Amino acid sequence: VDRYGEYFTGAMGAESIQKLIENFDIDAEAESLRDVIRNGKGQKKLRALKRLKVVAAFQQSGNSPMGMVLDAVPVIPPELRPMVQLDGGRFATSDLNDLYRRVINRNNRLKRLIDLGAPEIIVNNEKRMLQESVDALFDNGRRGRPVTGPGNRPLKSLSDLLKGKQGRFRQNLLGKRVDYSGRSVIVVGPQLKLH
Amino acid sequence: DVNFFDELRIGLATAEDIRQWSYGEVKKPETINYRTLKPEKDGLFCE
Amino acid sequence: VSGAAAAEAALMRALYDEHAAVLWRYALRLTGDAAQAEDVVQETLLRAWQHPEVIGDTARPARAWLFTVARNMIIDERRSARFRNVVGSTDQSGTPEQSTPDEVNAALDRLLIADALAQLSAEHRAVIQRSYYRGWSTAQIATDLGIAEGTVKSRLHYAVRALRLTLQELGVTR
Amino acid sequence: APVTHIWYFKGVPSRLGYLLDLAPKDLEKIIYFAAYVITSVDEEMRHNE
DNA sequence: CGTGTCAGTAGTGTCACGGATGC
């Protein structure tokens, strides 16, 4: 940049990828993969087949791939992340609140560094932490070591509300608790009829 | 609210769609006030 | 010139490469949360960029001033806001889930109120449904129905007792 | 500052790596501020100079 | 409000299986 900065443009972080997706020809890269697919060696063709599977979806559907890079993150309504009061006087909140709070804390600090004109090393190292925070909010533990809460317990992300046996699908949609029901011990009754 | 609707569509949420849903921005990181139990303005529980 | 402003950025990147990794370990021992230690590191080095007195003397240990700033940051976080909230997480076990009682008593009362309401004159029924169901004021109902102020007071006064008659005739508990 | 959805970066297979033909680890070095990436280069101006 | 004699991780005994990731 100090020498030939007039000739090229580079960047770091996520905003750079946002620029690469913008400076990307969907139809050309799709047909370029097709040309490789029509006549190619299976060793290097299978790797181009699966690429077309991703690119062709963005081409036909009409939705831009830019959605993979976020400028704003949505906040789930509070009753789905409720904060309850305890009989000891203190409180207890969902782990989603601590993840949203950490994203808010680091995003406001980044706004301070941008305003102050702080050195690029602080702003870039701050932008990295905001990436890890949103990554923790959506799927904590996916990359690297998870954000531990008090007691080395991994915080539950938004995607943890849908995963596995404890997720929303299996725990609250495929099976539910029902009214007008009961349970007791069973005892054999010979005098009873089969019905 | 009848129970017959054919398709359920899913798609990528534009950053502009996120603003279309949002009833406001969560600026402050605070939650509530630990005396009045009233949520702080622009917090994670802002009324 | 431009090189003088760039030398300040190379100076900050220098103390990053020599102090940031060690300062992160220090805050990690004091808090135990790595995501919090990163927050303390960024705030401590931000105050180093704002204090040229600490970056001036290289013959004086600047690492010690960083550990002390980080210590007085972790001790401030440890006050009131952490005091009440930090204790529990709903995701964590041992916390009772919030429950809402059933609407059985309310549904039965609503049914009995609807029955006693059907046995009222259209005037009295359209006045109690505008005072208690819509929560308007006495003059608001008077303005809507085109009647007098005391007319709304008298209709409400009787219709209430008319409902008490029908409820006590059906055995509703006082 | 813009941010990436971790579902499409770290989720296997890397959806971003398939779109931009970038390697997963190279993408990992880009997002988390470990390596710059060239967004554009004036190739004609470079030739004329 | 300001801070300054070195100041240094937690936690560590699953596994089968497939396919993208990587030298």
Added chain:
DNA sequence: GCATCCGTGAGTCGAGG
């Protein structure tokens, strides 16, 4: 062209803490 490594999954219901 291939060994590596990552990510995925691993019965149901009930009781007291």
Added chain:
RNA sequence: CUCGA
């Protein structure tokens, strides 16, 4: 956490 089929 511990137990029941």
